[model samples]
Target: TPSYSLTPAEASAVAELTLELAAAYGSFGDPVLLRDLPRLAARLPEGVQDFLREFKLADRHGHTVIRGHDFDQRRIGPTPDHWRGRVRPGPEFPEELLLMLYSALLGEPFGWATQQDGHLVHDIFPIRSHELLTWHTEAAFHPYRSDYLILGALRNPDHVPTTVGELDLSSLSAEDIDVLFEPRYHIAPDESMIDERPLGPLLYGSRLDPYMRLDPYFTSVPQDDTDARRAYDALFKVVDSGMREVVADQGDVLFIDNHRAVHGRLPFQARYDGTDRWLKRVCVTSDLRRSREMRATSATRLLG
Candidate 1:
């Protein structure tokens, strides 16, 4: 993974910028700020801008981490018992704005109408009864899935590791690769929605440096299509072998190229206490207008 660390001065500069924006916008949820995020993101520190500029280009790693910023435990408050609708901006607004600023460098942030009540920013934490799940991309079933997935750590008392795996083409046979390239597989919609299981290839783009849309647990291949099934099984083998753990400490942020990576978490016992691991998540699109038909208006970010 590509990584960047902010110097104390650079971190301070970012804090100042977010503070100023929060003062004017009140919340990161403000439409004005969100709509003009790319413009405002220009005000980010030069070093960060340079790093992300490179990350946005074709010459890059599939995932990145920006470290050196810290959060106030008291200010952010205890991890919520469960994610409820939208949240009001308070002590954590600056951090969220900072996350958006970082994300805006790669693309425009967007949300799904069926997920998190259509809020662009999302709160991710362990629900009491929900503990473990399979590895997958952000929203592979959607035609307009996020181009990038941004996650920032708010609290992680348990240090639960986020599992991430990148596609390794060199490890696969050419026959399997060709099988995966065919558009015969269907990816089922995630928990956000379950109606559309679009048919598409599991792998696309440059075959040498390809992009992938895989849901090992949800993607279905035609049982009669022996080649497709074999390819799917091979995909699971590589994804599992290449998988690794990432522990995002407080104030750390991860930017995942959703096209080339799959992420999930290791099973952990949630204490249901205020100190449980909590993360702020946002999905970004390099092209927002591609889904304009689903949005309510030309300016709205939410997609149905």
Candidate 2:
């Protein structure tokens, strides 16, 4: 099998294993309290171990925006056109390895959860030239929400309702709405009530948007990019592999689960000084019991 290619059987096996592992560790408190880093680290595959050596627990105070800064400054860039929707294979430096390392360090059993509501997985990926604006308001660092994956970006120029607007909420059930409204720890600028939590040195003091609460960027349609639908589908399949894609400059892949995990990008400068930071993103929900209709198809995935 090619490093980036997986047979259907292989993919199914990996997916099954991931689901089993997730189910076994589903208590949230179990993995968060019991998982041992040094021991787990010792057992990790060599390629994953090497990746860990380079993996520094993001300083937790850096304000580097995930999409705003230049590629050199932010240390990531847009996905290559050819690889836009493809999944990067593993057992060979999987992006999930890095995410796992972070998860272990944070003691977050669930892959990653969100601080902001309705934030989608796709908005944070395939980072573009000036999309930095979106990354700034995506995440926060208040222990409770910190465990979340911190998917992608959004901003509210004026402090309005902390709840997400501009999108219809009627379709969501009451339980889902309640889940969305529940407040987690939030840190923001002194002048604003909006939440602002830095991922690390890269994006320190970044705040969540007040007006748009729980905005799912991936679920929401992008004005441009007609191929967004196809891109979304391919990305989800990749996530089923149990590996996260964190492609650096069009190749970094970070695999993540929507239910068990949350993702966030740091805020950075978008000077457009001949370089722009970018990342291609896709979110996956692995709970087989969940309705298939809710899951994203290859093309429809991007639409949401």
Candidate 3:
């Protein structure tokens, strides 16, 4: 569990430490910290291996651009009728393998950023990816909208780009970025210039529905019997054990603990031309205590 008991000094110290680690690890390119998954898993706490066993591995591939709607539809399937509630696995179905690969890279030292607009940030071990930063930024902006739900890689970017011309980049502070968690709503009745939208059924029409009812967010209907809160609690324990201060320029292997945390990215100024802030993404599930069938091989299925 996260502790709010840290005094102002203590909090500042932790923050400073985090920045230091980020800086130290974020400088080098392609930090290959997780080349060996089994070896890395061996170093983790006892149950972590069990947790790893529960998941299937998949990779985000290199620089795959995922916009907001495209991302949302992906998780729920294309048509609502065909919606299986699980996200499709890429060519490399088991994303954990990619995370292991990323861990290997992170072991080196480097930073990351992204060029996309709105995206979610979830668990990607070692250094926090650019998507996480984006989610942090977005949460900072739409602090009030209850409808805003943060999901996957949008949390931070892989690297913060220097110029649109440069392909490689570094991470940026929360303050330097722009984030929006909720859709812009208009209250003025005569504001016809702004498009009027309806907040329909909970998970049907509203943005908040996905986070509130979707699998991994909250168990959907028919599968709501599973104790998601308990699962999340267990997941958070894993994050608490590995989390450290963000160091400047240094990259640390960060674990997303996807089942535990709901992540998102803040909206940012994008050139729309692809060469924006870019970060790689991948999903992993450890085959710990759970059986292989229990894990969603295609997309994350709502554990009923």
Candidate 4:
């Protein structure tokens, strides 16, 4: 399915698997701590499995915002400050299982040290005292990075905006698009990172393959290289100008093709009253073994 609404039977199938998985939760429903994703994927609804595979190729917008799934959510309380603040199973089982199922088709899902203590599934909600998420491609600054992003909504009553931006490769002149292949800028990890590693050079793409490696918001071009700086600035502006916004329904999840798009949210005045836009996020690599050196075992989805 390119995009779809779940049939009652399909929703029922998802509920059944969630029930089984929740019954097996250890460490109190930590998605990273759950090592049976492959097993769970095998039992996912046929339609869910189909979508998990089909969205591998992104739309022109670079993502697929899915709707029509259901969850119990009985004990799931207000969005917590972070993942560890919540420790129950079934409340988010259907959505969590769906994320793991989609992740299995893409590759392996993992987390970074700087974000929410490196839990494979990140808790995303507006913090009353903090700035809301701005546009960013996932883990672009990390040595080992993902090619896709998956987000599951737990709550979003205000219909707060979640936006994505995609660049039209064909729109750029061949000579212009070729500019990013050169490593002409430096990168600073976002404040989210707990590690204080120094910044590195920005290499948005290679001349031979055109693979992007940019974190536009956190990268800086050299003052000495006027042309390079212009190129970087132009690309950033073009992407920002083309951003498209969409709000997800409860139980909706979105899959993003990381190389094709970057994502962020609008400024929502946090109520501080507990109910706010909330989401769960996970990043997926195309090949799980590529990150093997960074992780001690396949069982641990947390990246060091």
Candidate 3 global CA lDDT score:
0.25
Per-model clash counts, in order, read 0, 72, 109, 1
Q: Give the lDDT of residue 249 in candidate 3.
A: 13
Ordered list by lDDT, greatest first: 1, 4, 2, 3
- List the global CA lDDT of all models: 0.81, 0.29, 0.25, 0.68
How much is 89 displaced in model 2, in angstroms?
25
The parts of candidate 3 lying over 4 Å away from their true place are: 1-36, 40-98, 101-253, 272-274, 288-291, 294-304
Clash number for model 4? Answer: 1
lDDT of 4 by residue, 32-103 (tens): 535567766878777667766766643334788667777555655666654556664436655665687778
- Measured against the true structure, the TM-scores of the candidates, in listed sequence, are 0.93, 0.26, 0.24, 0.84
Which model scores highest in TM-score? 1
State the displacement of the C-alpha of residue 188, model 3, in Å, after optimal TM-score superposition. 32
Q: Candidate 3's residue-wise lDDT over 131-239, tens digit each?
A: 2331111111111211221112222334432110100112222211111112221122210012334321111122221121112222122244233333333333432
User: Any idea how many clashes model 3 has?
Assistant: 109
Off by over 4 Å in 2: 1-20, 31-38, 57-102, 105-133, 137-304
